[PDB]
From Swiss-Prot, chains A, B:
It is found in: Golgi apparatus membrane; Endosome membrane. Its EC number is 2.3.1.4. Substrate binds at T60, K107, F108, I109, H110, E119, D120, V121, Y150, K151, E174, R180. Homodimer. It is a peripheral membrane protein. GO terms for cellular component: cytosol; endoplasmic reticulum-Golgi intermediate compartment; endosome membrane; Golgi membrane; late endosome. PROSITE patterns: GNAT. GO terms for biological process: cellular response to leukemia inhibitory factor; UDP-N-acetylglucosamine biosynthetic process. This is Glucosamine 6-phosphate N-acetyltransferase. Pathway: Nucleotide-sugar biosynthesis; UDP-N-acetyl-alpha-D-glucosamine biosynthesis; N-acetyl-alpha-D-glucosamine 1-phosphate from alpha-D-glucosamine 6-phosphate (route I): step 1/2. The gene is GNPNAT1. GO terms for molecular function: glucosamine 6-phosphate N-acetyltransferase activity; identical protein binding.
Length: 182, 182
């Protein structure tokens, strides 16, 4: 039952106004031309057998996941309309090489506005030098703007701030706080 | 058509294990006994006529909101299962006096785990001294733990860190970054 149906409408990524990109690419790549033998598209359940968790596990721990577990989560994300899990496939190898999620959050403030979040971004190690993290960040940042978000946020270590400033992000005055449940 | 149907199941707030509360209350209040003539419950569309935006507008700007706008947003939040917009009503006055949102975010990492977020917390000014922000933070923090989140996060100004440490939050090493779209 893992199939090729995308989590969200793929034309949203073609429709992204790439003239609004501010990151430097050499060579020039775009969501429509992401690089030699690469496709930038929404996640589908079939990516479970294209090494999706192999990419993700490079960011943090993915643990033990059943197929039914993965598909239950995928379906909930699709149904909400709020999740934009975006992958890069090397179509020569039939393998995911990069992933990133845009989450939309609906509010009542600012005249019932929407905000974006960048989550779970990781590029497979053997793809260093393919500019995919840059492409994913720029694409998703511009996607949220396309989806009428008033702002988009993310978290990173101070050492990596410079990277995100290139897509228009600045350091907030607010502290990021967290509680991990035991 | 604005009615009394809660955004989420209200028994979730009664079912919150309040023995796990770590905030200091004097007098002792709980989600079940939030204070004289107060009820702690999910938001319903009828709260539009109970001064919900009057409370919210004290946190930030709410702008101009149509009834149809408010109900479209409410319904999307209810449908996703991911939004826990929680209010305090003074039932003597028939008015909202406090609000806070728990957002659930579904991931694939950590064996398809869930994370919480605390958003849009505000207590009406005339309710200073009723311990409602403390009650809301503790309640929602414990609610996310109940809903099987592995962690919960929020953002605040450094000046306000001490307040949130009381519910188990610590300052992250990661910087909060933001882009506001023009
Ligand atoms: N910005 C990313 C998050 O999107 C990701 O979820 C997190 C994983 O870390 P953890 O495994 O501690 O939740 O790392 C970074 O902070
Ligand atoms: N933690 C709260 C957020 O939950 C809220 O959404 C924000 C509103 O600020 P703005 O109006 O700049 O989005 O204020 C704080 O940062």
């Amino acid at each position: 039952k893992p199939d090729e149906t995308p989590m969200f409408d793929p034309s949203l990524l073609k429709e992204v106004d790439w003239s609004q990109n501010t990151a430097t690419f050499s060579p020039a790549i775009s969501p429509t031309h992401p690089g030699e033998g690469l496709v930038l598209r929404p996640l589908c359940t079939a990516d479970l057998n294209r090494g999706f968790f192999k990419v993700l596990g490079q960011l943090t721990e993915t643990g033990v996941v059943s197929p039914e577990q993965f598909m239950k989560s995928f379906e909930h994300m699709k149904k909400s309309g709020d999740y934009y899990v975006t992958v890069v496939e090397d179509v020569t190898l039939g393998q995911i090489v990069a992933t990133a999620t845009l989450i939309i959050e609906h509010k009542f403030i600012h005249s019932c506005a929407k905000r974006g979040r960048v989550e779970d971004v990781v590029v497979s190690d053997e793809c260093r030098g393919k500019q995919l993290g840059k492409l994913l960040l720029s694409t998703l940042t511009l996607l949220s703007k396309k989806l009428n978000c008033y702002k988009i946020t993310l978290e990173c270590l101070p050492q990596n701030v410079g990277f995100y400033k290139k897509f228009g992000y600045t350091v907030s005055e607010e502290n990021y706080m967290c509680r991990r449940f035991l």
